[PDB]
Design a protein around this ligand. Structure first.
Ligand SMILES: [Mg+2]
Length: 119
RNA sequence: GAAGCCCUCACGGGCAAUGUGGUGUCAGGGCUACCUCUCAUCAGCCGACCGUCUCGACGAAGUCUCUUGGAACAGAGCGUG
């Protein structure tokens, strides 16, 4: 909400999550805000996911701007538990980072484009 | 970075990426490359002596003489541990 500056259409979110699932199987993904943060910092991040139902918002507030000054692309997900499930967790997750896609580097790269365009 | 914890005989359930658990805590630590090594620390097993306080068992040698007296545990005499 305070860290969310644009709205992601339901359909776009689906493609993104789908991509994430194939990312855990084919490529590599980091689950958890701390682990995600280090990707953006270490630059190993290609696409980071951030839930919008996070409370306290503090836990994620930094993701956006941090990602911006690191060139890393990021997309918003409405449900915290969907991102967790999509990441392959039995629990939810406030943030995830696709650290080098897998059999999705295409669809992924394009999701990043759609978002950049979503302003 | 799920390698973790709680309940339950089990099955099963619950917690946990908003981080369980590993590492680590100024002889600073981590990371990378090395040297040597462990006897530090931490976790868990076992598990007292002595002392002190109280309680209890066992535990030596006269119940002799005369006098006074209601009564000798007194006086005088003899004897014992
Ligand atoms: Mg520890």
């Amino acid at each position: 909400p305070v860290y969310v500056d644009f709205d992601v259409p339901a359909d776009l979110e689906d493609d993104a999550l789908e991509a994430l699932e194939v990312a855990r199987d084919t490529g590599a993904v980091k689950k958890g805000t701390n682990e995600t943060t280090k990707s953006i910092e270490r630059g190993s991040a290609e696409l980071v996911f951030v839930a919008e139902d996070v409370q306290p918002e503090e836990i994620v507030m930094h993701i956006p701007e941090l990602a911006d000054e690191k060139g890393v692309p990021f997309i918003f997900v409405e449900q915290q538990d969907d991102l967790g499930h999509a990441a392959g967790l039995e629990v939810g997750s406030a943030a995830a980072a696709v650290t080098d896609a897998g059999a999705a580097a295409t669809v992924l790269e394009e999701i990043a484009d759609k978002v950049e365009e979503l302003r």
